[PDB]
Design a protein around this ligand. Structure first.
Ligand SMILES: *CC(=O)N1CCN(S(=O)(=O)c2ccc(C)cc2)CC1
Ligand SMILES: *CC(=O)N1CCN(S(=O)(=O)c2ccc(C)cc2)CC1
Lengths: 304, 304
């Protein structure tokens, strides 16, 4: 029993982190096979970041300008290419610690673990969600760029995120491992404002199921609702609309608890309308939206 | 910027986790050098756990009754001894992945990372605090016993916790790596009730400093207080008394923010007296007490 915000074990990703230095910029790279992935803005001065022309900046860089250090051993760079907003540095040595991996582009609402790194060295690991406005609420200081977000399926690491920038509002923007930003963000130091940070309704319902499963039940009520009635309330509270696809995904938690999804919706509806009245659910005074239904099933069944 | 509940990277500890099976009980062990550490109740039936005589139960066990599996390779057990509530299984092979390590007994209020494991396989990692009542609020299912809590100083893993039991209230009790329980708990399935779960005042103040440092400042007020005045309010709210030692420890966060510890105490005093009024601090609707002053400095400076 007990329910915790839980990251994947980070070992498989620790073994992939390297330091990339270009000129006087140092940040993190991801070493998989004989390729090192890193944010293209490694080639920028802070001055460049105001209005960078990356193709133009890159012309002035050779393989030997990309200094790549794994532990305290330098990797030989034998090639470099730009793909979207990442550089791929071909090194002469395959990472001997390369795990089985995929690159996946996640949807908003999906959760992942971040291994915060500085100078290619892991500092800590935390669980994130891709927000519906395509930001993440991370913990990133200067030097953390190139830190990656990932899920693990048994022995396969799916890389979904690379850290690129902080918005003036202190939220975070990055790319998948093909270098395409989540949302409309650009690797340029400009006016970039996040859209509405809506609550991931399906995740709140998963976490209410996790609560019931762990003995926190005070918020179960005598009511039910409909997807349409519920969604009117969700709209009013800047909650994402709930779809039949969401209901379907909550099916197993429904089955396990014997609480119909629409009943739990009615419970969430009253919580939105009435607030928590100073009570807590799984040690939180607000409704948690960074557990997926898949995360709840995983933690409540003890998958490895 | 941004502030997250952050675990240490788990890689160094992943490489230490093994499966221990005695009869029909399977749980996790910690493999350091040529010793495997595990909860002594591995030798118990569920029947035994009602009133176990561990010295008597152990007489019936030989080295070859302790089945130890690292990945899918069996370790040869050449010795076994009971120290307090852990077994030490001497194996014929030094763990080639043994990190630099210490065993430390932490104080209540101190935080650590847990690597939740099942069948010697890591499932996830989260940050805990040792509660003032010597419980932790973990996420542990059957099979998770022998999962360990740890801090890392650069390359040295300090092991502070091994998981042993869930109380009927769904909080968790365990030992240091010398097998001595935190608090009054016994590895027996009996009436064991936790004492008062008080709030770790020094940790709440550290986290209020983390908030100010990260731009959440609405709760800064025009007031100050005294240790004595503050402590009257702390008593009333089941907060731990604040000592000069606590004030001293908050000195650097004081220095960095230019907010005197006693001023921040006055801010906390008003938050206790007035509540949050539906506002949030670092995305929480209650006062977080599972960051140490050392944790705040670490995450706010980017240590590896
Ligand atoms: C986001 C990130 O890690 N990087 C790499 C470091 N650069 S920088 O331009 O070298 C820089 C370092 C430190 C400060 C305080 C500012 C800028 C930024 C991008
Ligand atoms: C806490 C823990 O992991 N252990 C090891 C497993 N035992 S047990 O007695 O084998 C057991 C397993 C599963 C259930 C549902 C009950 C008991 C408990 C202690």
């Amino acid at each position: 029993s007990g329910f915790r915000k839980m990251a994947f074990p980070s070992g498989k990703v620790e073994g992939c982190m390297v330091q990339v230095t270009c000129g006087t910029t140092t940040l993190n790279g991801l070493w998989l096979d004989d390729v090192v992935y890193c944010p293209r803005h490694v080639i920028c001065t802070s001055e460049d970041m105001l209005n960078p022309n990356y193709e133009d900046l890159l012309i002035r860089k050779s393989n030997h300008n990309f200094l790549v250090q794994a532990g305290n051993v330098q990797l030989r760079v034998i090639g470099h290419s730009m793909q979207n907003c990442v550089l791929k540095l071909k090194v002469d040595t395959a990472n001997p610690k390369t795990p089985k991996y995929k690159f996946v582009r996640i949807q908003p609402g999906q959760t992942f673990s971040v291994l915060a790194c500085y100078n290619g060295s892991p500092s800590g690991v935390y669980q994130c969600a891709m927000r519906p406005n395509f930001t993440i609420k991370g913990s990133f200081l200067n030097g953390s760029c190139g830190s990656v977000g990932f899920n693990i399926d048994y022995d396969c690491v799916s890389f979904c995120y690379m850290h690129h920038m902080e918005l003036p509002t202190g939220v975070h923007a990055g790319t998948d491992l093909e270098g395409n930003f989540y949302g409309p963000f650009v690797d340029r130091q400009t006016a970039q404002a996040a859209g509405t940070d809506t609550t991931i309704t399906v995740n709140v319902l998963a976490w209410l199921y996790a609560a019931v499963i762990n003995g926190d039940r005070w918020f179960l009520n005598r009511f039910t609702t409909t997807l349409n009635d519920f969604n009117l309330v969700a709209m009013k509270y800047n909650y994402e609309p709930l779809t039949q696809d969401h209901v379907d995904i909550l099916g197993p938690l429904s089955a396990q608890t014997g609480i119909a999804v629409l009943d739990m919706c009615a419970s969430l509806k009253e919580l939105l309308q009435n607030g928590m009245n100073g009570r807590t659910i799984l040690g939180s005074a607000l409704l948690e939206d960074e557990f997926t239904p898949f995360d709840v099933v995983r933690q409540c069944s003890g998958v490895t």
